[PDB]
Amino acid sequence: VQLVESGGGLVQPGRSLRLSCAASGFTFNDYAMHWVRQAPGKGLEWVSGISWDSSSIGYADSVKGRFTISRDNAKNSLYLQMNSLRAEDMALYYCVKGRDYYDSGGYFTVAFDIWGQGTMVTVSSASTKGPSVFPLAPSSKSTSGGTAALGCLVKDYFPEPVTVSWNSGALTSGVHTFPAVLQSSGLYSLSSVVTVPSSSLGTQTYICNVNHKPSNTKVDKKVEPKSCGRLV
Amino acid sequence: GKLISTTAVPW
Amino acid sequence: DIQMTQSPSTLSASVGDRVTITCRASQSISRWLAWYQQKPGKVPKLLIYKASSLESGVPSRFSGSGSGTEFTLTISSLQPDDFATYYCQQYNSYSFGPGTKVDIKRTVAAPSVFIFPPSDEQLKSGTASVVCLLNNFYPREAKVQWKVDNALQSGNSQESVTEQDSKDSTYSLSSTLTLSKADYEKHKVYACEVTHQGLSSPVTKSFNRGEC
């Protein structure tokens, strides 16, 4: 049993996408079918649904007039036509099988029992861009006990993702690479930090290796200490 | 009360 | 329009605990309510539907009750598979609750706090990012406030948090204050003030631009 979505990708605001979902392993025609979306880092939002017999269709207020759900039972497929796309429609879109129940003269969905893995929809007017990589320099303001923190600010890139390693994979303990944030500019930003022994600081080389495949950008940035206030 | 429902049943 | 709420928003639990989480509807939804489990990077999983029916294959420590507007999900004895976020949904019109996250309880640990000035390379480009790092703390709740020459900042910072660490069960968080070069050059003292359950007083990390 499976639901396989396709049709996702990168689209500019105001343009359209058509999502597909191919079902197998159950009698597709016998079930309501639905679309659910999840914006990055956020909760679940139901988008649209259609009864087993196609007689009843519904939409979330946030998409109605712009999205059209349909099904082709002969092809065991569900579709979502998405027009006039906005940044707020950016999300992973799951195709979802309903389980239905009869009560008070009506047959209606009571559970979503099978979910596809989702197809990712990215709505942005931003152009593809590699990050600038800036040092997060270790200083007297970034020590704690016998340790110093340092890192790299991976700023202003598009689209996701970037990868970050330290000293070509030799440094992994104490590394935290944060989830990217989407800035108001439409570009993403991310920091990777690490705590290291302060006693070897400035003698020991620390290089962050940043890779942004969508732009074919590879940056190795050596992170050097900084004078920031007096010793303490 | 139901946003999506039908009187028809697949059995 | 039916609003679904959930409480608590977060819960710290230990293997063996009985945990009960709540879901509420702004108007009657009878028994048309289901509960889902979701973990990072994974698909949601149906647990309970029609308020109290346990889905086939789901362990029997999960139970649901309620009808009308108040609903509860109970895990009689939490197991490691159960640390996750839990969502309810109503089937009159498909609105979801905002989710309850159940994470792994450990001893309270205050963050270690570090601050980073902007780089000369970045300043050259016309922008200044000031970064404040909160490292290895628990619980997740934490407040970071920026002050520039002691004036509280608003609307010019963003934060990001890691998932709970699989070995020591802590979180880490960055907060990044972003200014134009000209605005950075108009002030002298840049300070990150951190509040957290593990701290008896707020911690402030700061620097003077002229010394840094």
Tab-separated table of C-alpha atoms in Angstrom:
chain	number	residue	atom	x	y	z
A	1	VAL	CA	0.000	0.000	0.000
A	2	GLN	CA	1.382	3.385	-1.074
A	3	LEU	CA	0.640	6.913	-2.211
A	4	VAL	CA	3.331	8.456	-4.444
A	5	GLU	CA	3.175	12.219	-4.976
A	6	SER	CA	4.818	14.125	-7.798
A	7	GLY	CA	4.623	17.518	-9.426
A	8	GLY	CA	6.320	19.569	-6.707
A	9	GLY	CA	9.195	21.895	-7.270
A	10	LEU	CA	10.196	25.534	-7.367
A	11	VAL	CA	7.683	28.079	-8.662
A	12	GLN	CA	7.519	31.866	-8.662
A	13	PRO	CA	4.616	33.645	-6.913
A	14	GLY	CA	1.520	33.834	-9.104
A	15	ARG	CA	2.445	30.810	-11.211
A	16	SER	CA	0.833	27.353	-11.135
A	17	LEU	CA	1.739	23.784	-10.290
A	18	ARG	CA	-0.197	20.546	-10.724
A	19	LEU	CA	0.407	17.843	-8.142
A	20	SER	CA	-0.221	14.142	-8.831
A	21	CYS	CA	-0.639	11.184	-6.476
A	22	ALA	CA	-0.559	7.562	-7.680
A	23	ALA	CA	-2.181	5.046	-5.321
A	24	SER	CA	-1.562	1.333	-5.097
A	25	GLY	CA	-2.370	-1.581	-2.816
A	26	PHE	CA	-5.973	-0.623	-1.982
A	27	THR	CA	-9.253	-0.076	-3.866
A	28	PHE	CA	-8.727	3.626	-4.526
A	29	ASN	CA	-12.287	4.271	-5.771
A	30	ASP	CA	-13.730	3.115	-2.448
A	31	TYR	CA	-12.208	5.926	-0.330
A	32	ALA	CA	-12.308	9.652	0.177
A	33	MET	CA	-8.912	11.148	-0.714
A	34	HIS	CA	-7.301	14.282	0.706
A	35	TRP	CA	-4.298	16.643	0.536
A	36	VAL	CA	-2.551	17.874	3.708
A	37	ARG	CA	0.386	20.317	3.782
A	38	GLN	CA	3.089	21.224	6.283
A	39	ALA	CA	5.120	24.402	5.987
A	40	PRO	CA	8.767	24.023	7.045
A	41	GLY	CA	9.012	23.764	10.818
A	42	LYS	CA	5.257	24.189	11.306
A	43	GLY	CA	2.153	22.098	11.972
A	44	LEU	CA	-0.320	20.328	9.720
A	45	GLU	CA	-2.927	22.075	7.564
A	46	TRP	CA	-5.651	20.255	5.633
A	47	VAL	CA	-5.860	21.599	2.092
A	48	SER	CA	-8.608	19.809	0.123
A	49	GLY	CA	-10.631	16.623	-0.060
A	50	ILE	CA	-12.966	14.620	-2.294
A	51	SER	CA	-15.472	11.890	-1.416
A	52	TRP	CA	-15.128	8.326	-2.723
A	53	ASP	CA	-17.838	9.017	-5.335
A	54	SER	CA	-16.513	12.488	-6.299
A	55	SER	CA	-19.901	14.032	-5.446
A	56	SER	CA	-18.563	16.199	-2.596
A	57	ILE	CA	-15.472	18.452	-2.638
A	58	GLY	CA	-14.053	20.800	-0.007
A	59	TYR	CA	-11.218	23.313	0.345
A	60	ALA	CA	-9.506	25.133	3.150
A	61	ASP	CA	-10.553	28.798	3.167
A	62	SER	CA	-6.893	29.742	2.579
A	63	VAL	CA	-6.789	28.007	-0.836
A	64	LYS	CA	-10.363	28.018	-2.128
A	65	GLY	CA	-10.811	29.714	-5.500
A	66	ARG	CA	-7.163	28.949	-6.298
A	67	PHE	CA	-6.831	25.156	-5.847
A	68	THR	CA	-8.873	22.437	-7.601
A	69	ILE	CA	-8.936	18.834	-6.369
A	70	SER	CA	-9.899	16.005	-8.723
A	71	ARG	CA	-9.472	12.249	-9.089
A	72	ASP	CA	-9.117	9.826	-12.012
A	73	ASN	CA	-10.253	6.460	-10.704
A	74	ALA	CA	-9.255	4.676	-13.909
A	75	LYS	CA	-5.659	5.742	-13.256
A	76	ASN	CA	-5.827	5.302	-9.451
A	77	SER	CA	-4.704	8.931	-9.209
A	78	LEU	CA	-5.498	12.062	-7.226
A	79	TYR	CA	-4.617	15.583	-8.363
A	80	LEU	CA	-4.313	19.128	-7.033
A	81	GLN	CA	-4.212	22.043	-9.467
A	82	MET	CA	-2.663	25.010	-7.646
A	83	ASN	CA	-3.031	28.468	-9.209
A	84	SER	CA	-1.859	31.923	-8.123
A	85	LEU	CA	0.670	30.425	-5.758
A	86	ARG	CA	1.948	32.521	-2.842
A	87	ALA	CA	4.896	32.280	-0.482
A	88	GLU	CA	2.493	31.054	2.225
A	89	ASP	CA	1.684	27.987	0.091
A	90	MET	CA	5.270	26.778	0.437
A	91	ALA	CA	5.043	23.383	2.104
A	92	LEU	CA	5.527	19.680	1.783
A	93	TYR	CA	2.246	18.391	0.283
A	94	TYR	CA	1.081	14.909	1.375
A	95	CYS	CA	-1.405	12.789	-0.497
A	96	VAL	CA	-3.630	11.118	2.083
A	97	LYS	CA	-6.180	8.264	2.027
A	98	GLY	CA	-9.335	8.775	4.037
A	99	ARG	CA	-11.180	6.250	6.142
A	100	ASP	CA	-14.911	6.974	6.100
A	101	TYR	CA	-17.900	6.363	8.358
A	102	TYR	CA	-21.694	6.589	8.048
A	103	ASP	CA	-23.616	8.649	10.613
A	104	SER	CA	-26.808	10.705	10.657
A	105	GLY	CA	-27.584	10.144	6.997
A	106	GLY	CA	-24.123	10.886	5.637
A	107	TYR	CA	-20.862	9.164	4.739
A	108	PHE	CA	-17.776	11.162	5.723
A	109	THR	CA	-14.079	10.859	6.509
A	110	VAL	CA	-13.130	10.122	10.124
A	111	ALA	CA	-9.400	9.373	9.755
A	112	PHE	CA	-6.378	9.751	7.484
A	113	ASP	CA	-4.895	6.261	7.708
A	114	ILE	CA	-2.338	6.224	4.842
A	115	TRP	CA	-0.017	9.156	4.029
A	116	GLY	CA	2.431	9.611	1.185
A	117	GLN	CA	5.981	10.826	1.830
A	118	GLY	CA	5.067	14.216	0.335
A	119	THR	CA	6.212	16.364	-2.562
A	120	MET	CA	7.944	19.630	-1.721
A	121	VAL	CA	6.485	22.891	-3.042
A	122	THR	CA	8.774	25.933	-2.932
A	123	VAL	CA	7.197	29.259	-3.841
A	124	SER	CA	9.732	32.065	-4.132
A	125	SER	CA	10.721	34.959	-6.357
A	126	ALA	CA	14.345	34.627	-5.214
A	127	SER	CA	17.106	33.752	-7.671
A	128	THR	CA	19.555	30.917	-7.029
A	129	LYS	CA	22.500	32.240	-5.005
A	130	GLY	CA	25.457	30.823	-3.101
A	131	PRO	CA	26.085	31.917	0.485
A	132	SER	CA	28.612	34.318	1.812
A	133	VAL	CA	30.458	32.635	4.675
A	134	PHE	CA	31.503	34.802	7.601
A	135	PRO	CA	33.563	33.803	10.660
A	136	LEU	CA	32.031	33.703	14.124
A	137	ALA	CA	35.327	34.548	15.688
A	138	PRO	CA	36.322	33.169	19.111
A	139	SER	CA	37.098	35.984	21.540
A	140	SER	CA	37.072	36.705	25.248
A	141	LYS	CA	33.299	37.117	24.830
A	142	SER	CA	32.825	33.544	23.549
A	143	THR	CA	34.527	31.460	26.254
A	144	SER	CA	32.995	29.324	29.014
A	145	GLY	CA	35.255	27.508	31.440
A	146	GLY	CA	38.118	25.972	29.474
A	147	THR	CA	36.275	26.068	26.169
A	148	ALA	CA	35.825	28.572	23.382
A	149	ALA	CA	32.916	28.711	20.933
A	150	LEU	CA	33.445	29.593	17.282
A	151	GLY	CA	31.533	29.061	14.060
A	152	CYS	CA	30.575	30.206	10.591
A	153	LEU	CA	27.621	32.338	9.512
A	154	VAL	CA	26.349	30.943	6.201
A	155	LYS	CA	24.323	33.881	4.913
A	156	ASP	CA	22.053	34.858	2.015
A	157	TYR	CA	21.716	31.706	-0.096
A	158	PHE	CA	18.921	30.119	-2.127
A	159	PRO	CA	17.468	27.504	-2.275
A	160	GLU	CA	17.927	25.095	0.599
A	161	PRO	CA	19.991	23.148	1.476
A	162	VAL	CA	23.590	23.882	2.436
A	163	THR	CA	25.870	21.419	4.159
A	164	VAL	CA	28.537	22.370	6.729
A	165	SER	CA	31.458	20.306	7.993
A	166	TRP	CA	34.480	21.278	10.086
A	167	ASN	CA	38.102	20.428	9.218
A	168	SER	CA	36.845	18.154	6.409
A	169	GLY	CA	34.917	15.888	8.809
A	170	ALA	CA	37.678	15.566	11.414
A	171	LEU	CA	35.788	17.835	13.844
A	172	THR	CA	32.269	16.585	14.734
A	173	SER	CA	32.054	16.550	18.541
A	174	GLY	CA	30.390	19.717	19.869
A	175	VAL	CA	29.209	20.895	16.426
A	176	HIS	CA	25.695	22.358	16.200
A	177	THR	CA	24.527	23.379	12.718
A	178	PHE	CA	21.254	25.229	13.099
A	179	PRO	CA	18.168	24.992	10.863
A	180	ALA	CA	18.171	27.718	8.241
A	181	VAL	CA	15.934	30.750	8.681
A	182	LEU	CA	14.165	32.444	5.796
A	183	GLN	CA	14.960	36.145	5.907
A	184	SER	CA	12.641	38.936	4.753
A	185	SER	CA	14.898	39.250	1.666
A	186	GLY	CA	13.815	35.761	0.548
A	187	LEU	CA	17.304	34.348	1.113
A	188	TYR	CA	18.193	31.829	3.787
A	189	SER	CA	20.766	32.103	6.554
A	190	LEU	CA	22.273	29.592	8.939
A	191	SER	CA	25.047	29.371	11.523
A	192	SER	CA	27.224	26.406	12.411
A	193	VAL	CA	29.031	26.585	15.754
A	194	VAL	CA	31.455	24.460	17.722
A	195	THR	CA	33.063	24.495	21.146
A	196	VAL	CA	36.771	23.707	21.246
A	197	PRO	CA	39.546	23.796	23.863
A	198	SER	CA	40.526	27.377	24.491
A	199	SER	CA	44.140	26.371	25.334
A	200	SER	CA	45.050	25.632	21.689
A	201	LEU	CA	43.066	28.573	20.288
A	202	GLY	CA	44.795	30.424	17.456
A	203	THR	CA	47.366	27.681	17.133
A	204	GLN	CA	44.782	25.137	16.040
A	205	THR	CA	43.254	25.624	12.601
A	206	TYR	CA	39.440	25.556	12.339
A	207	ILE	CA	37.960	25.626	8.824
A	208	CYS	CA	34.263	25.278	8.012
A	209	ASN	CA	33.518	23.518	4.709
A	210	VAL	CA	30.286	24.905	3.256
A	211	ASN	CA	28.674	23.364	0.165
A	212	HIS	CA	25.676	24.757	-1.736
A	213	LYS	CA	24.967	22.285	-4.498
A	214	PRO	CA	22.199	24.380	-6.259
A	215	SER	CA	24.800	27.055	-7.076
A	216	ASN	CA	27.754	24.727	-7.307
A	217	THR	CA	29.378	26.774	-4.490
A	218	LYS	CA	32.081	25.294	-2.261
A	219	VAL	CA	33.645	27.570	0.382
A	220	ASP	CA	36.275	26.715	3.001
A	221	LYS	CA	36.512	29.485	5.577
A	222	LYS	CA	39.284	29.626	8.167
A	223	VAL	CA	37.927	31.021	11.434
A	224	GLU	CA	40.536	33.073	13.302
A	225	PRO	CA	40.405	34.518	16.836
A	226	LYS	CA	39.283	38.083	17.458
A	227	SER	CA	40.212	40.711	20.055
A	228	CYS	CA	36.904	41.638	21.671
A	229	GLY	CA	37.416	43.318	25.019
A	230	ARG	CA	40.004	42.648	27.678
A	231	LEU	CA	41.083	39.329	29.120
A	232	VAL	CA	39.084	38.209	32.162
B	1	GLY	CA	-22.489	19.777	9.632
B	2	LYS	CA	-19.991	18.048	7.320
B	3	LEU	CA	-17.801	19.951	4.864
B	4	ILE	CA	-17.397	16.789	2.779
B	5	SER	CA	-19.956	13.983	2.828
B	6	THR	CA	-22.123	11.857	0.548
B	7	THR	CA	-25.255	9.796	1.106
B	8	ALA	CA	-23.812	7.086	-1.142
B	9	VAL	CA	-21.826	4.211	0.364
B	10	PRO	CA	-19.251	2.056	-1.445
B	11	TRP	CA	-20.743	-1.235	-0.272
C	1	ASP	CA	-14.929	27.773	11.576
C	2	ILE	CA	-13.839	25.425	14.332
C	3	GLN	CA	-10.739	26.278	16.362
C	4	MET	CA	-8.821	23.319	17.802
C	5	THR	CA	-6.554	24.002	20.771
C	6	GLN	CA	-4.134	21.628	22.498
C	7	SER	CA	-2.536	21.576	25.939
C	8	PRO	CA	0.104	21.551	27.140
C	9	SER	CA	2.030	22.930	24.158
C	10	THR	CA	5.091	20.986	25.356
C	11	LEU	CA	5.615	18.221	27.893
C	12	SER	CA	8.768	16.760	29.466
C	13	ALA	CA	8.342	13.066	30.118
C	14	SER	CA	10.237	9.970	31.147
C	15	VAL	CA	9.909	6.371	29.990
C	16	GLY	CA	7.311	4.769	32.240
C	17	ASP	CA	5.285	7.942	32.821
C	18	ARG	CA	1.584	8.106	32.182
C	19	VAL	CA	1.058	11.161	29.951
C	20	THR	CA	-2.301	12.701	29.100
C	21	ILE	CA	-2.610	15.548	26.631
C	22	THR	CA	-5.690	17.585	25.827
C	23	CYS	CA	-7.443	18.798	22.711
C	24	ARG	CA	-10.405	21.155	22.664
C	25	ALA	CA	-12.863	22.297	20.005
C	26	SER	CA	-14.450	25.752	19.986
C	27	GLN	CA	-17.825	24.141	19.263
C	28	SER	CA	-19.238	20.637	19.496
C	29	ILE	CA	-17.621	18.068	17.217
C	30	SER	CA	-19.318	15.040	18.817
C	31	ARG	CA	-16.822	12.138	18.502
C	32	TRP	CA	-15.340	13.091	15.093
C	33	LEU	CA	-11.792	13.604	16.342
C	34	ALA	CA	-8.559	11.788	15.553
C	35	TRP	CA	-5.032	11.837	17.002
C	36	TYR	CA	-1.803	11.638	15.004
C	37	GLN	CA	1.839	11.129	15.957
C	38	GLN	CA	4.647	12.831	14.052
C	39	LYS	CA	8.441	12.791	14.432
C	40	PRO	CA	10.985	15.040	12.663
C	41	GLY	CA	11.342	14.233	8.974
C	42	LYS	CA	8.663	11.536	9.096
C	43	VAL	CA	5.078	11.166	7.989
C	44	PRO	CA	2.226	11.577	10.511
C	45	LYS	CA	0.820	8.311	11.908
C	46	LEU	CA	-2.820	7.697	12.776
C	47	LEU	CA	-3.261	6.615	16.393
C	48	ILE	CA	-6.908	7.099	17.413
C	49	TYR	CA	-10.049	8.061	15.519
C	50	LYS	CA	-13.729	8.593	16.353
C	51	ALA	CA	-12.306	9.983	19.653
C	52	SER	CA	-11.628	6.568	21.226
C	53	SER	CA	-11.104	3.873	18.567
C	54	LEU	CA	-7.525	2.599	18.562
C	55	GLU	CA	-6.144	2.149	15.042
C	56	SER	CA	-5.132	-1.350	13.954
C	57	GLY	CA	-1.547	-2.158	14.883
C	58	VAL	CA	-1.117	0.740	17.345
C	59	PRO	CA	0.103	-0.287	20.847
C	60	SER	CA	-2.623	-0.466	23.481
C	61	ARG	CA	-0.886	1.971	25.869
C	62	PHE	CA	-2.497	4.637	23.631
C	63	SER	CA	-6.101	5.518	24.454
C	64	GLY	CA	-8.404	8.403	23.665
C	65	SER	CA	-11.564	9.693	25.266
C	66	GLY	CA	-13.975	12.570	25.009
C	67	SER	CA	-16.973	13.810	23.091
C	68	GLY	CA	-18.268	17.295	22.260
C	69	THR	CA	-15.510	19.830	22.980
C	70	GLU	CA	-13.000	18.250	25.348
C	71	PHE	CA	-10.794	15.351	24.292
C	72	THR	CA	-7.802	13.569	25.800
C	73	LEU	CA	-5.067	11.267	24.533
C	74	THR	CA	-3.391	9.061	27.149
C	75	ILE	CA	-0.215	6.997	27.035
C	76	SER	CA	-0.399	4.690	30.029
C	77	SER	CA	3.358	3.986	30.064
C	78	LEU	CA	5.540	6.134	27.804
C	79	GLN	CA	8.066	4.214	25.730
C	80	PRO	CA	11.073	5.555	23.807
C	81	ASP	CA	9.150	5.208	20.509
C	82	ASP	CA	6.627	7.751	21.857
C	83	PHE	CA	8.730	10.946	22.051
C	84	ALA	CA	7.092	12.928	19.259
C	85	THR	CA	4.625	15.733	18.549
C	86	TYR	CA	0.928	14.816	18.800
C	87	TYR	CA	-1.822	16.487	16.777
C	88	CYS	CA	-5.584	16.262	16.983
C	89	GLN	CA	-7.946	16.901	14.048
C	90	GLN	CA	-11.728	17.322	13.799
C	91	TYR	CA	-13.642	15.867	10.853
C	92	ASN	CA	-16.538	18.284	10.520
C	93	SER	CA	-14.210	20.613	8.594
C	94	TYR	CA	-10.658	19.197	9.021
C	95	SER	CA	-8.940	21.831	11.177
C	96	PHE	CA	-5.911	20.587	13.122
C	97	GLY	CA	-4.811	21.428	16.627
C	98	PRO	CA	-1.409	23.135	16.906
C	99	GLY	CA	0.363	20.067	18.348
C	100	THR	CA	1.832	18.935	21.669
C	101	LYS	CA	5.491	18.035	21.775
C	102	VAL	CA	6.563	15.344	24.197
C	103	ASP	CA	10.339	15.440	24.733
C	104	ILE	CA	12.765	13.592	26.982
C	105	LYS	CA	13.028	14.854	30.553
C	106	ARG	CA	16.518	15.478	32.006
C	107	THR	CA	17.853	17.679	34.806
C	108	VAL	CA	17.503	21.428	34.322
C	109	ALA	CA	20.648	22.753	32.614
C	110	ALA	CA	21.210	26.470	32.099
C	111	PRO	CA	22.652	27.468	28.709
C	112	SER	CA	26.239	28.527	28.285
C	113	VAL	CA	25.992	31.926	26.560
C	114	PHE	CA	28.436	33.224	23.916
C	115	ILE	CA	28.351	36.354	21.737
C	116	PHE	CA	30.005	37.055	18.371
C	117	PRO	CA	30.590	40.473	16.771
C	118	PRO	CA	30.205	40.945	13.023
C	119	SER	CA	33.165	40.146	10.803
C	120	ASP	CA	35.161	42.782	8.956
C	121	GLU	CA	34.337	40.842	5.766
C	122	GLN	CA	30.590	41.269	6.384
C	123	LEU	CA	30.872	44.907	7.474
C	124	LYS	CA	32.662	45.615	4.221
C	125	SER	CA	29.484	44.365	2.408
C	126	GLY	CA	27.220	46.840	4.243
C	127	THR	CA	25.558	44.591	6.841
C	128	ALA	CA	26.293	43.590	10.436
C	129	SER	CA	25.119	40.313	11.978
C	130	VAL	CA	25.557	39.905	15.733
C	131	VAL	CA	25.120	36.336	16.970
C	132	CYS	CA	24.248	35.092	20.435
C	133	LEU	CA	24.614	31.375	21.152
C	134	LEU	CA	22.742	29.475	23.880
C	135	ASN	CA	24.471	26.105	24.186
C	136	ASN	CA	23.269	22.781	25.649
C	137	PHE	CA	20.321	23.756	27.846
C	138	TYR	CA	17.099	22.183	29.111
C	139	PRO	CA	14.231	22.681	29.050
C	140	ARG	CA	13.661	24.136	25.599
C	141	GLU	CA	11.924	27.294	26.766
C	142	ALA	CA	14.319	30.254	26.660
C	143	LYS	CA	14.078	34.009	26.146
C	144	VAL	CA	16.732	36.079	24.372
C	145	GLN	CA	16.469	39.881	24.266
C	146	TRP	CA	18.772	42.244	22.375
C	147	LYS	CA	19.782	45.619	23.665
C	148	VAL	CA	21.749	48.291	21.771
C	149	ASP	CA	23.075	51.039	24.031
C	150	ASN	CA	20.476	49.608	26.483
C	151	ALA	CA	17.494	50.233	24.171
C	152	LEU	CA	15.477	47.016	23.804
C	153	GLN	CA	15.406	45.798	20.214
C	154	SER	CA	12.374	44.425	18.411
C	155	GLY	CA	11.759	43.007	14.954
C	156	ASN	CA	15.415	42.777	13.809
C	157	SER	CA	16.470	39.380	15.191
C	158	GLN	CA	15.729	35.745	14.334
C	159	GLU	CA	16.365	32.542	16.200
C	160	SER	CA	16.836	28.892	15.406
C	161	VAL	CA	16.911	25.850	17.661
C	162	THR	CA	18.292	22.358	17.305
C	163	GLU	CA	16.392	19.155	17.921
C	164	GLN	CA	16.909	17.566	21.340
C	165	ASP	CA	20.371	15.982	21.444
C	166	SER	CA	20.235	12.166	21.301
C	167	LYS	CA	23.026	11.722	23.840
C	168	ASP	CA	22.667	14.483	26.501
C	169	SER	CA	19.049	15.531	25.735
C	170	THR	CA	19.834	19.275	25.592
C	171	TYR	CA	18.965	21.989	23.095
C	172	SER	CA	21.045	24.777	21.576
C	173	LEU	CA	19.781	28.029	20.079
C	174	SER	CA	21.128	30.918	18.049
C	175	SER	CA	19.725	34.420	17.963
C	176	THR	CA	20.991	36.697	15.196
C	177	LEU	CA	20.586	40.482	15.273
C	178	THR	CA	20.889	41.980	11.797
C	179	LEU	CA	21.630	45.661	11.126
C	180	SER	CA	22.915	47.822	8.320
C	181	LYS	CA	26.570	48.847	8.682
C	182	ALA	CA	25.529	52.454	9.248
C	183	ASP	CA	23.163	51.533	12.114
C	184	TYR	CA	25.772	49.238	13.680
C	185	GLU	CA	28.215	52.168	13.556
C	186	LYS	CA	25.770	54.472	15.311
C	187	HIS	CA	25.813	52.569	18.589
C	188	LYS	CA	28.414	51.286	20.885
C	189	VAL	CA	27.164	48.515	23.261
C	190	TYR	CA	25.639	45.321	21.836
C	191	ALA	CA	24.124	42.970	24.445
C	192	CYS	CA	22.281	39.636	24.431
C	193	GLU	CA	20.216	39.034	27.618
C	194	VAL	CA	19.151	35.420	28.301
C	195	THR	CA	16.414	34.142	30.633
C	196	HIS	CA	16.054	30.446	31.389
C	197	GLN	CA	14.766	28.188	34.148
C	198	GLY	CA	18.332	27.063	34.936
C	199	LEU	CA	19.447	30.644	35.649
C	200	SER	CA	18.693	32.449	38.903
C	201	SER	CA	19.219	35.832	37.140
C	202	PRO	CA	19.346	36.701	33.425
C	203	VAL	CA	22.764	36.304	31.816
C	204	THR	CA	24.015	39.193	29.663
C	205	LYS	CA	26.800	38.849	27.110
C	206	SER	CA	27.846	42.180	25.644
C	207	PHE	CA	30.671	44.028	23.918
C	208	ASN	CA	31.650	47.581	23.124
C	209	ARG	CA	32.113	48.092	19.394
C	210	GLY	CA	35.111	50.330	20.056
C	211	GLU	CA	36.850	47.587	22.018
C	212	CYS	CA	35.799	44.851	19.588
